[PDB]
């Protein structure tokens, strides 16, 4: 399992 | 290969959305704790799963949330 | 007193919705297990809570689901 | 806690 950061845009 | 999805996540803030690559899938887990509304209280939660094509590196998967509330999960062509 | 609410529960079948009176509140718990869709799989869940006015008997609370997917929870005036 | 049956209609 790899986490994916949710980038604010 | 590539990966590209667009999702409407209108009720959730960036901190309420978790994107992860588990196996051959990209998972989106969105959850918000109980909050007030016009008639009562409301808590919401969803889990979406998408398959990750073979030629796509899981490390190349990025996620961003637009000010309109559209979550885009992408992995640029390799 | 009375109680009357209308809810849109479009993604859930009657067996996926649980209505209960807990204390001074009416709770609605809707959950559907993972199901296929245009792009991947999707599982959804929500919890809504409404207060039950004092003059309303919890035993007088009924719930029905319309073929349009509108859940109505009511307790006739006493 | 009292359960409320969801009547199909």
What CATH code is carried by the domain that includes residue C55?
Answer: 2.60.40.790
Residues in chain C within 8 Å Cβ distance of D3: 18-20
| Resolution attained, angstroms | 2.6
Q: Is B46 on the interface with C (CB under 8 A)?
A: yes
Whether C71 contacts C9, CB under 8 Å: yes
Give the number of domains in chain C. Answer: 1
- Residue B68 belongs to what domain range? 3-78
Query: Chain A, 1-9: which have a CB under 8 Å from a chain B CB?
Result: 1-9
State the structure-solving technique.
Answer: X-ray
Chain A: list its partners (3+ Cβ pairs within 8 Å). Answer: B
Residue of C7, B25, B22 whose CA lies nearest to D6: C7
Residue C3 is inside which H or E element, if any? strand C3-8
What residues contact residue C46 under an 8 Å CB cut-off, 6+ apart?
B42, B43, B44, B45, C28, C29, C30, C31
DSSP C11-72: T--GGGEEEEEETTEEEEEEEEEEEE-SSSEEEEEEEEEEE--TT--GGG-EEEE-TTSEEE
Question: Nearest CA of chain C to the CA of D9: how many Å?
Answer: 5
């Amino acid at each position: 399992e790899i986490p994916v950061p949710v980038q604010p845009s | 290969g590539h990966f590209s999805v667009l999702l409407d996540v209108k009720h959730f803030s960036p901190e309420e959305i978790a994107v992860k690559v588990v196996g051959e899938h990209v998972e989106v887990h969105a959850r918000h704790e109980e909050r007030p509304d016009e008639h009562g209280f409301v808590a919401r939660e969803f889990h979406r799963r998408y398959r990750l094509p073979p030629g796509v590196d899981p490390a190349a998967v990025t996620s961003a949330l637009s000010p309109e509330g559209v979550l885009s999960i992408q992995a640029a062509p390799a």
